[PDB]
């Protein structure tokens, strides 16, 4: 009865959500030809959230593939699980957005946005009531930051009631690429503060941090760290997709995690995770998932939760478990670690229980929390932005294609006051 | 062909490492509350 | 749809364009006659029964090095109008190539560039190769860029020059050709890369161990720079850096568009399979202040942006560690308005062995194109030579005879002088 | 119930404790794959004092391997019973402790102690309450002494009410490997009095001496010594894990063996010991167990206890036996041996019966005494320390990483204060 | 992780290292081409497919020995630029090898140290080999110790140099060169061990019964010392001694680190069969003033620290028995401020014999490295040599004419004089 429409923009966005449709497929028994194998009532009764029928029995994903190049959307199509998406929902664009935010937002992305908005209006409005939109993009390039936020602006005015959950990938600046990361990041943040209900902040360095000091991988590749993101994307909408003892919804997360509308930037994480020679050494109980869901490194953003306070927090447990432990462990972290938890909200925790655990595992859990330590991400991009800005850095591309100087100062204002608003509640 | 991903469906990584070891040639005796054979 | 048009003007441009057009042709696998026994679309059309024809325009005023192309092995691969020649040469004379004997071959060149650009479903850029220091490369080449900018605007004009080397130049009147060709290279050029010949000699004599290199071996390493620079145009990888990506991350201000090259997995047999060539090893040798391809030591300069293009079996996390260890090294310093100063690209296609060549099998490579305040010395070096020669008006009677006044010399030294001034004000 | 964390540091601590985990596996029935091979619940009912359930049924030992060198602790994994240990309880670190106390306690132990407090915290806090800790380490070396001393001061302020039972090996005067052993010993002792509840001195002279005069060996080796220590190590803990006529937890050892808080340095002896000459030819009833534990060439220290008094003394017995024979034989000890016992407190002997004998024996005994003869261990190490420190021997190393000259003078003055306290009761 | 970069400088350093790498390749199982048919990590690298290039830097000013390795049986073992060599030698002159021609080769010396230490992770120590009684051994031996100290701090710099002999010195300027070496190996060498040729000459004559040994027949015993001392760094042992162990138990004061070495059993095939090789007798044959690899009997001084490296199938009980019978035997002394003084590192792996060498296949061996106050004699016999020669200013015009200033002979003599006055100060 409720549908999530996934729109993926950018090279980062298309590759992450290709893993997302791969993990949703085997959570739902979908073969990469559309056929469904394996017999279970629960794996199809709520598949309308992510798949539609095709009068051939083919379950087709709600994917609105987008990038301003015939590049990674060719590799997504040619790879495994690439025949699922409609060839119609593959809007190409041939001019190219070269890591420039104004390219996707103003001067090349404005002539293809009228087609991807037509596609998403054909595919999302043609039902009784859609639950919301799920947008996957990186705010580091030109396509995800530029075209992604342009569609975000147009969707929030056409549907100013639905939930837009955005798994944004902020530029992690300690080790990174492209020299225009602070320009593309800050020029998108001052839009995501208004017209975006939820923004889950993801940094690549934290994905390497899990891949090095939790999974003990040899060579963490882009596919492995896109798999960890798709774990969190599937885990948040678990109750929307399967029955449970304590069901939830994306609006239940929104109303229990947003004290004020501007503060909606969440730290995400997901860990019943373990190394290769330790799953047969490590147990599995609610306290053990709890202690690896607050700790330091399970966060997929490079922001230490100890360097701040939790305004509010939520926990999406999955699988067969006792309802006493899922309540008592959130109490136990609340009263033991009280410094990293605000007081003007008492009892800052939501728990919610799915009954169907993910494939292979016995129980999993995903964190989404509104920690005020997210100020150190906007500060770590602002101090790079003002460094370039004082001597008028790589800018004649941005100004030459139709941006005045006031847009950049307005970018600094709405992101400096975001840090200041997080200061008042820390 | 893109590089292979090393992570299973249950989010446990697939193929293991070997530690860069240290010449495991040792010697073995016995005195285990019985004093040598 | 990705399509770059190469325009090789001058004798040196023809020869470096030779070594380039085989990393383009039979690296894609096409035979000498022009048959593969669509990655070729970056450099080639296709005319029916598997005939891919190079997207090149060969320009020269002496019909003797382009005639070697018409008579060599590869005469049936080029179309017999893509090898445009003349009757008489330009003779290191910028005013002859630009004002007198240039305006009878430029009308043929713009026809062939027209027929090779209306056969385009989106032109990425004009990769024009020339030799600053001669007559038709500094002359006709300068007029070609002025005509191409007026008609074919808003799409890039990446130029790799052959700027006159400090000591070795094999000419005497090259300061007049270099300083007065600066105007085209400063305004009518979107990306300029300084690429002299002494530094290629030094790379060949130190890493590659060929103690007696010829121009043919110099054209080798220039070509390997070009193939790695357009590697992501044609082949897949983790991150792609096309020619629009290239100029937008390496050009801080519109006037400053001058860069340096280094492609340093330079190994050869005995120095090839002994050395473990990892991602850290090749990145350190790329930033090493002797493999710069301009005699343009950056230890006395400030780095601005870098364009490390890893190519082969390179893992992205190994790129991440290699960038980090360059940043922690103190002698590799960066200007303060640039915390993020690298644009990492990764190709999947490995570099290619050379039979009878100089390099060997290498599984990974780096080709970083970097802008720095250190490039302000390649123009101040030739400021000394121009000032000495123009003091008592040597060689001026040549340049004035065929149609430029002597005030062209003073305004081009003024264009050079306003040029280095903009580097130390940016650096400070 | 109760739990014990087995901290072990250094080459001595890892190798001795690996033998301990060998013996406690053979005594609990743990096979060297993680399973249970025996069939009796009198073994398994208290495996939750040294092990943790790990989903599949595998009992992972509750040990914290720690070494500031990837050397012999990699060789622990190679040998048998070496895969039971959990691989992220392995605290690696390349660095390399030269035999040096301030490398272990000031420079290189500091970057590595933050990981091992994390591992101790994840295990100890996972349960409700544990009985205490157990540390095996070497005073002579650098990584076992200097780092093991800093951990037992960190976990003291973290949990200032659980026991600190340290199976420490003291440097030997005659058997002298490592040149800077008296320095690292003296810098370790003066904090070991103020941050360890119980210290058990195990000198390697007596571990050799047991082998070739009572066990009648031909080639005494290090594995032989580690078994002799480990039989004592189970011989102090079996009243916890196994039932009995008169049970005794380790705090009952603490209060009955420590008349005054600074003096807690003990001597151990495990003596149903025999050879192949007399393994058939020897009664193994009660009165000669007490004859062998109260025998000079039996204690695990070169601290000949006829030259001193026996302020307190426990003897935790094992095996099938009667409560009158233990009481009347140790009353016989207090009667005939009267001059070598102390006189101002009565009944300086503690009874406790552990009704399960060790594997292969029908009864055993483990004697832990607080003899004032331990002050001659502190007289020989002080003799070697003053012999070096008069002429400033080997100090340019120790002052290099920022440990002052004065830190040696409170090290010697505090250790002289232990000599005087052990002297005034004699 | 554990790894030792070995820098050989000087002609004696080259042939010593040639015996060292002959033993290292044989023991670890690397062919002369660099192919096996973590123990290779301590001395070799790891190239593409099963290749192990030695982490060695051969450095010399004469070319006649370095190129003979390049044209010898181990040509393809080495990557062909860690064997750097100049065009002219140092002419048995410290001034020439340190101030004039060593400057144009030290830049290539440290550049190869950079590339050999960038791939390494956790370098344990620089093991230097030279002859201080020569030209380039003394001269570049100083110049590398200054340059490595100012760039690479912390990390240990061992130096197994060869001191001039008392009697057979094969030079006439041999006291000038290694007086000027004293400024180098005092405040810049971490640990220095004396290995002079006339002592291994007497060991070969007495133990191996080789009446007429060559330099090779000494260098193979030298390689046995390097194998035994880095043995715990590569093979598993009962007690582990690494370089950080080797300095913290054995070097009392910062300015007393001069050492002697002793090996046992150096016994040939015809004798080892007719004899027991046991732990006890290889120790008393080690603490004997004819197996010292310096003519310096310990009875004329007092021991301060000892570093017995037992290596083989040695049980640790008999090691303590050997230490016990050495704590007896009042002939051997020990200083009063060190009641202890025996660091015994035990390995398991038996020695590797070279086929066609001169040692039998032994099962157990010990390598003393000892510090004593008797080692002041090693310099004190030399004090007569320098005074008798500097008196009427002989051989001076080479040094002062080269570029080394006059007067440096005096404070190099005063630094050496303060070295003896430190040794009888600590021995009282
Ligand atoms: N890379 C490269 N450079 C060359 C080659 N031949 C000449 N040069 C350089 O070109 C410079 C001289 O300019 P030319 O290229 O000969 O002049 P031109 O472009 O032929 O024009 P004209 O002088 O009129 O013939 C010399 O300084 C050389 O360094 C070559 O084959 N390869
Ligand atoms: N152990 C050993 N010592 C050697 C060897 N060759 C020479 N020596 C000693 O080195 C001393 C002189 O130094 P050399 O190594 O010969 O000369 P150098 O250090 O290369 O300096 P130059 O005079 O410039 O050649 C002689 O007195 C020899 O005793 C050798 O092969 N092995
Ligand atoms: N997680 C993830 N990040 C990516 C991927 N590809 C690129 N990125 C990151 O995205 C940034 C580049 O932006 P990108 O989305 O690729 O450019 P765009 O296509 O113009 O939007 C770089 O900092 C990369 O680290 C991917 O497949 N997965
Ligand atoms: N009981 C026992 N003693 C040992 C063992 N290994 C070394 N020792 C003794 O302890 C001393 C060396 O201490 P060491 O382990 O090197 O200390 P560390 O450097 O801090 O690890 C030597 O005198 C040995 O006699 C062992 O496995 N068991
Ligand atoms: Mg020409
Ligand atoms: Mg009781
Ligand atoms: Mg020499």
How would you characterize this protein structure?
Chains A, D: GDP 2 binds at residues 11-12, 15, 138, 142-144, 177, 204, 222, 226. Chains A, D: Its cofactor is Mg(2+). Chains A, D: Keywords: Cytoplasm, Cytoskeleton, GTP-binding, Magnesium, Metal-binding, Microtubule, Nucleotide-binding. The structure is cut from a larger assembly and holds two copies of chain A (426 residues), one copy of chain B (37 residues) and two copies of chain C (428 residues). With 426 residues, chain A is α/β, with parallel strands linked by helices. Chain A has 14 helices and twelve strands. Chain A is globular and about 60 Å long. Chain B has 37 residues and is largely without helices or strands. Helices cover 0% and strands 0% of the residues of chain B. Chain B contains no helices and no strands. Chain B is elongated. Chain C has a nine-stranded mixed sheet with strand order 3-2-1-4-5-6-7-12-8, with helices on both faces. Chain C has a three-stranded mixed sheet with strand order 10-9-11, with no helix packed on it. In chain C, helix 5 links the parallel strand 4 (125-129) and strand 5 (159-160). The longest helix of chain C has 21 residues, at 407-427. At the D-E interface, helix 13 of D face helix 10 and helix 13 of E. The complex binds guanosine-5'-triphosphate (GTP) (2 copies), guanosine-5'-diphosphate (2 copies) and magnesium ion (3 copies).
């Amino acid at each position: 009865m409720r549908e999530i429409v996934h729109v993926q923009g950018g090279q980062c966005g298309n590759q992450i959500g290709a893993k997302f449709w791969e993990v949703i497929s085997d959570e739902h028994g979908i073969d990469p030809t559309g056929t469904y194998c394996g017999d279970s009532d629960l794996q199809l009764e709520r598949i309308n959230v992510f798949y539609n029928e095709a009068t051939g029995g083919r379950f087709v994903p709600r994917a609105i593939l987008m990038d301003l190049e015939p590049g990674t959307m060719d590799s997504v199509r040619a790879g495994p699980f690439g025949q699922l998406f409609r060839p119609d929902n593959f809007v190409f664009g041939q001019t190219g957005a070269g890591n420039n935010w104004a390219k996707g937002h103003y001067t090349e992305g404005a002539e293809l946005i009228d087609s991807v908005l037509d596609v998403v209006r054909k595919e999302a409005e043609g039902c009784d009531c859609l639950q919301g939109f799920q947008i996957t993009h990186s705010l580091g390039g030109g396509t995800g930051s530029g075209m992604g936020t342009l569609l975000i602006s147009k969707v929030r005015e056409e549907y100013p009631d639905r939930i837009m959950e955005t798994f944004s990938v902020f530029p992690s600046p300690k080790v990174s690429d492209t020299v225009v990361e602070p320009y593309n990041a800050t020029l998108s943040v001052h839009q995501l503060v208004e017209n975006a209900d939820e923004v889950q902040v993801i940094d690549n360095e934290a994905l390497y941090d899990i891949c090095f000091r939790t999974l003990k991988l040899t060579t963490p590749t882009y596919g492995d760290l896109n798999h960890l993101v798709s774990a969190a994307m599937s885990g948040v909408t678990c109750c929307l997709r399967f029955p449970g003892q304590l069901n939830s919804d994306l609006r239940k997360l929104a109303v229990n995690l947003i004290p004020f509308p501007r503060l909606h930037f969440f730290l995400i994480g997901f860990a019943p995770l373990t190394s290769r020679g330790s799953q047969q050494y490590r147990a599995l109980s609610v306290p053990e998932l709890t202690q690896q869901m607050f700790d330091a490194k399970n966060m997929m953003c490079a922001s230490d939760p100890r360097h701040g306070r939790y305004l509010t927090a939520s926990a999406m447990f999955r699988g067969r478990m006792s309802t006493k432990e899922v309540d008592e462990q959130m109490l136990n972290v609340q009263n033991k670690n009280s410094s990293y938890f605000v007081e003007w909200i008492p009892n800052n925790m939501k728990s919610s229980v799915c009954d169907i655990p993910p494939k292979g595992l016995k129980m999993s859990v995903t964190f989404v929390g509104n920690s005020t330590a997210i100020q150190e991400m906007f500060k770590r991009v602002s101090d790079q932005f003002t460094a370039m800005f004082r001597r008028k850095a790589f800018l004649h591309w941005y100004t030459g294609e139709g941006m005045d100087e006031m847009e950049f100062t307005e970018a600094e204002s709405n992101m400096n006051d975001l840090v200041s608003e997080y200061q008042q509640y820390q | 062909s893109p590089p292979e991903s090393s992570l299973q469906s249950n989010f446990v990584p697939s193929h293991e490492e070997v530690g860069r070891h240290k010449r495991f040639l040792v010697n073995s005796r016995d005195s285990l509350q019985g004093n040598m054979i | 749809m990705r399509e770059v048009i190469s325009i090789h003007v001058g004798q040196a441009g023809i020869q470096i364009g030779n070594a380039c057009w085989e990393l383009f042709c039979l690296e894609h696998g096409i035979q000498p006659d022009g048959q593969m026994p669509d990655a070729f679309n970056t450099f080639f059309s296709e005319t029916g029964a598997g005939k891919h024809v190079p997207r090149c325009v060969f320009l020269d005023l002496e019909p003797t090095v382009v005639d070697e192309v018409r008579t060599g092995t590869y005469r049936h691969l080029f179309h017999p109008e893509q090898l445009i020649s003349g009757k008489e040469d330009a003779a290191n004379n910028f005013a002859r190539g630009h004002y007198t004997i240039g305006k009878e071959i430029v009308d043929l060149s713009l026809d062939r560039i027209r027929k090779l650009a209306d056969n385009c479903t989106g032109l990425q850029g004009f990769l024009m190769f020339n030799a600053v220091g001669g007559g038709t490369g500094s002359g006709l080449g300068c007029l070609l860029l002025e005509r191409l900018s007026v008609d074919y605007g808003k799409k890039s004009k990446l130029n790799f020059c052959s700027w006159p080397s400090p000591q070795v130049s094999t000419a005497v009147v090259e300061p007049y050709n270099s300083v007065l060709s600066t105007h085209s290279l400063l305004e009518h050029t979107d990306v300029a890369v300084m690429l002299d010949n002494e530094a290629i000699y030094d790379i060949c004599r130190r890493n590659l161990d060929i103690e007696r290199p010829t121009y043919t071996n110099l054209n080798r390493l220039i070509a390997q720079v070009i193939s790695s620079l357009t590697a992501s145009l044609r082949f897949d990888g983790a991150l792609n850096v096309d020619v629009t990506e290239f100029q937008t991350n390496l050009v801080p201000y519109p006037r400053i568009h001058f860069m340096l090259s280094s492609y340093a997995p330079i190994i050869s047999a005995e120095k090839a399979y002994h050395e473990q060539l990892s991602v850290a090893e090749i990145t350190n040798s790329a930033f090493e202040p002797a493999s710069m391809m301009a005699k343009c030591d950056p230890r006395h300069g400030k780095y601005m942006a870098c364009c490390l293009m890893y190519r082969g079996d390179v893992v992205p996390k190994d790129v991440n560690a290699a960038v980090a260890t360059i940043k922690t090294k103190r002698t590799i310093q960066f200007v303060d308005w640039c915390p993020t100063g690298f644009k990492c690209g990764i190709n999947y296609q490995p570099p290619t062995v050379v039979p009878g060549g100089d390099l060997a099998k290498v599984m990974r490579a780096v080709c970083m194109i970097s802008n720095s305040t250190a490039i302000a010395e390649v123009f101040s070096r030739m400021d000394h030579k121009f000032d000495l020669m123009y003091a008592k008006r040597a060689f001026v009677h040549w340049y004035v005879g065929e149609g430029m006044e002597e005030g062209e010399f003073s305004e081009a030294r003024e264009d050079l002088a306003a040029l280095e001034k903009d580097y130390e004000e940016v650096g400070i």
